[PDB]
RNA sequence: AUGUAUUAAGGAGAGUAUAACUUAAUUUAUGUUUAUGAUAGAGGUUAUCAACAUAUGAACUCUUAGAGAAAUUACUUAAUAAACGAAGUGAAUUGAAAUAUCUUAUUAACUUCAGGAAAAGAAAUCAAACGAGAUUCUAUGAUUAGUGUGAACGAAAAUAGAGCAGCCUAUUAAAAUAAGUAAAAUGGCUUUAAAGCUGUUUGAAUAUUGUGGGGAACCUUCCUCAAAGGCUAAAUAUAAUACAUGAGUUACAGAGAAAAGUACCGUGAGGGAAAGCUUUGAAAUAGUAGUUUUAUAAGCAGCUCAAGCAAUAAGAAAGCGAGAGCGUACCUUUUGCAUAAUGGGUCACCAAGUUAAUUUUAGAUGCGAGCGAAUUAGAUGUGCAUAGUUAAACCGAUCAUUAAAAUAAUGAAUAGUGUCUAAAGUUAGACCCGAAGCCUGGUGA
RNA sequence: AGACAACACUGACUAGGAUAGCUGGUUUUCUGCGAAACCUAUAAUAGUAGGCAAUUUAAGUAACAUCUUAGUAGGUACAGA
RNA sequence: GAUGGGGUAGCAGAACGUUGAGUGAAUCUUAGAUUUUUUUUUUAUAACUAAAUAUAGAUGAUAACUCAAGUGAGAAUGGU
RNA sequence: CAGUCGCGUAAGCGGGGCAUAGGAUCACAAGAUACAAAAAGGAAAGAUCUUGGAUUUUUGGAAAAGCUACGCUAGGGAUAA
């Protein structure tokens, strides 16, 4: 079929409430390991710093005087002390600060983005939830933390405990790999929760996600809005002349 | 196992790396494919060097010159103009101007000194259109007019075309009038726009004027000629008879 | 290494609570918060068991009054490095396979002057018949136009980004709008012949009511600007300090310097080290021990055949090896080397086709007559291809030669573009090591 | 006396800025194929370029080699005067 | 019951190893990870078995795939 | 093949000589072509075709004398005693 369904759950209870429809060219693409490779290696090149530096014989300190006479000494002739053959000489072909970045067509990078989403979709590792995706911390703790009654030590020890038993109950913790939460904007509870308990998972903002980030953990828990915005910004090879992008099949039962 | 530990490029994409001077069994050791103690091994030979023999460019010399004043025209064939109208990418009901030709993708994405209509596929072109270009072939003019259309050749420049696409200049297939009897209606037309528009330039050179001044090219200055006048600004049609 | 922020004179000698710094070398006070901090005790030498913020006493000598053999004399509330900037002067190595023009190169270097930056700057600018609108920095344009016999050298318009600011009543105090000037000849510089700089000899005009300059020999029309008077921040350069980042280094690395311009060498200018920690302990080398062989023999010390010795014990033979035979090291360089041709005392470590820009090809792969890039509505941002032909334009699926033309003749027509991997051409140190010499500035009788 | 000018003087020392068609060196393994020391040009003759041509792997083959049969060009050995 | 097998200059293909990086908040380790040795086996520039010695829970080691190179030395009267 | 000339009754012959021994580019000079013309009209300087002047004789094309026993460097034993 040209379109595929996408279930939108309520994050805490994981109740399927709504049903959206996307194109098969969005979440049902074939697995292209060569295209995913070019995108993953393309991001690493741009992340690299590339600032290593070594001195050549033209940059090593000292005078360029001739060390020994050209002949008469019985030893091997020598020029400057900065030669690579000498003790503290310069590395001829040593590292220099340069740009390690490579190029990748916007259309290939957009195909690798939807190919990574399709890899998670066809495997059941893509969970779309309703907007407002945050960890439902207890109201009692939230009331204390704001009040300032709780110390930093206890405040962090509780979040680490609640987040652990919460992820372990959902089978989303360190035992079942990990989970990557993707939201449109930063959320205090979600990001603060996984900043203190990172073994159970992590949280990212849509602007900070990469193709590699969509393949590291065991599942991708993304918001309904972030997914639509993620695919809408990575379909350059498709919208060139549209297809189903968030077509609501079943509305939430208000 | 992990997806990230299973990605690779196609095997045909990978090619052997040759690191020279790294042992005899590599096949490139101890000489790196240079030979034995020659100029090509010690130093470098200039690329233009032939050993001393004079190159042909000297014994024969360079022929001709490169024209630095010729206009670079974008070539458009009727074969392609028909393919666009049928596909629905060019509206034949409206005037086809350079703005619509450039924004259609029929001449590409590069704007040049002008657009010339050529007559490839003139046997199958039967669509009535109203096109305006900088130049046109004698075959294209007949093909356009035979199908029931109109064609006009107007003076353009590389800078005028950019302003047309950018919307800074409005298209017009008529020259700027001359005389104190048109200053009012022209100034009023400018005030009504309420927006700063650049005028399309008119030809200034002898050749450019003569081109758009003759009816063979359907030039937009041909109306300035008399039925017996010549387009040339210097030459005249001689008279026949006994005198 | 880069980026960000802040700052805009540097060193030495001797002395001193040896974390504490100037003969006062551990001065004296204020405010706030103090474990819910900051990021109900003991302790004044058995010390400084308090951090932040704001003040405060002291702070020697020389560079640095004069003089002198700097750290002295003699006086006294004596005091400013480098780098970066502008102008002036201005090479040679090198390349052209020699070499004069050229290139190297408005380079290095030197001198003068100046500030935290300096310089430049609001068109006598560019464009081309449409218009842009000061200066500065970066990229593209551009291995282009063009110059040159060559080798090579090499713009501008425009575009994009960083910054953005205009004025003379200059936010610091200036013009009554500029005459020995513009310009010419001549000698040079720059350079494309224009424009611009200039020694010598000469020498104009007065504003779009078309006066003057420019638009690349030159004249003309038109357009454009208005010299001979000035002010102006930012983006830029350099140095120091702090911080951030790292498929940067981790001790023969990084830096020359993990205690360094010190020790040491040199009359001098100048040259210029070694050296981390409590961990690990390779090779070479030396003295022994165990097993085995060796005093009738002419071994590049290995290989083929192999007696014997070798395990206190059931099981289990590694190693050494008498005797027989084969074998004249290695590398380099050469027609050809055991060669008495080259190089190496041994071992360990350091040590050589790399990077950038540009221009190509193969394979793979994305899109596809488009590719790439970039982007409430609009516009915007290199390039390549899409049509060929000619010296070139007109021309054009046709074009060129045929001094008129004409199937008379001959040649030339159909998928590109981007990326990755790898190999490449070109320019840069260009795979690594090595001269004699040339030039500039300093040092020494 | 080409003598001396602080190891150096037919032109010192020191700092900055080179080239070298010459010599030497250029580091792991396996696999496949495999030359040349000739011609032409050169301010060349220790160099270099273009050919002949080594290699890679595609597109062709009325390919290439050899023999047989028939045919052709050309004057050596020999023999002769 | 396929065909082929010396090799310098040189051209080409396929791999191993070294250092760092990603998967890695992963895997394993006093029931012994790691131990520059010795030993055993396997068509093997490599890894593996076992033994002896010492004793680490991570500033430890590590398969596989991939990325990037200051990546491989009996030869330079080479340097320390 | 086109153009247009000569000789020949005609077929036909004629793009120098019975054959084999005379160097370019660049620059310069003389004719033609109508290509481009740095705002525009012209021009200058260029382009195409024809043609001319060379011990460019080291004749694929530098404007070029010696000494060193005071000599130096890189190499060759690829050429000597
Ligand atoms: K020197
Ligand atoms: K002038
Ligand atoms: K073309
Ligand atoms: Mg070093
Ligand atoms: Mg890469
Ligand atoms: Mg070989
Ligand atoms: Mg080679
Ligand atoms: Mg090669
Ligand atoms: Mg050699
Ligand atoms: Mg050679
Ligand atoms: Mg004084
Ligand atoms: Mg004094
Ligand atoms: Mg020369
Ligand atoms: Mg040129
Ligand atoms: Mg004035
Ligand atoms: Mg003047
Ligand atoms: Mg001038
Ligand atoms: Mg002037
Ligand atoms: Mg002009
Ligand atoms: Mg003025
Ligand atoms: Mg060091
Ligand atoms: Mg170490
Ligand atoms: Mg080391
Ligand atoms: Mg040892
Ligand atoms: Mg005996
Ligand atoms: Mg001997
Ligand atoms: Mg020897
Ligand atoms: Mg020796
Ligand atoms: Mg090394
Ligand atoms: Mg190396
Ligand atoms: Mg290949
Ligand atoms: Mg003498
Ligand atoms: Mg002497
Ligand atoms: Mg063979
Ligand atoms: Mg031979
Ligand atoms: Mg010559
Ligand atoms: Mg030579
Ligand atoms: Mg064989
Ligand atoms: Mg072989
Ligand atoms: Mg061990
Ligand atoms: Mg050695
Ligand atoms: Mg003109
Ligand atoms: Mg010759
Ligand atoms: Mg010849
Ligand atoms: Mg004598």
From Swiss-Prot, chain A:
Subcellular localization: Mitochondrion
A biological-process GO annotation: translation
Example of a GO cellular component annotation carried by this entry: ribosome
Shown chain mapped onto the complete sequence: 62 to 324 of 325
Keywords: Mitochondrion, Ribonucleoprotein, Ribosomal protein
Function summary: Component of the mitochondrial ribosome (mitoribosome), a dedicated translation machinery responsible for the synthesis of mitochondrial genome-encoded proteins, including at least some of the essential transmembrane subunits of the mitochondrial respiratory chain. The mitoribosomes are attached to the mitochondrial inner membrane and translation products are cotranslationally integrated into the membrane.
Subunit structure: Component of the mitochondrial large ribosomal subunit (mt-LSU). Mature N.crassa 74S mitochondrial ribosomes consist of a small (37S) and a large (54S) subunit. The 37S small subunit contains a 16S ribosomal RNA (16S mt-rRNA) and 32 different proteins. The 54S large subunit contains a 23S rRNA (23S mt-rRNA) and 42 different proteins.
Keyword presence, Ribosomal protein: yes
Broad class of the protein's primary localization: mitochondrion
UniProt family annotation: Belongs to the universal ribosomal protein uL4 family.
Lineage: Eukaryota, Fungi, Dikarya, Ascomycota, Pezizomycotina
Record protein name field: Large ribosomal subunit protein uL4m
Region of interest: Disordered: 52-97
Gene Ontology molecular-function annotations: structural constituent of ribosome
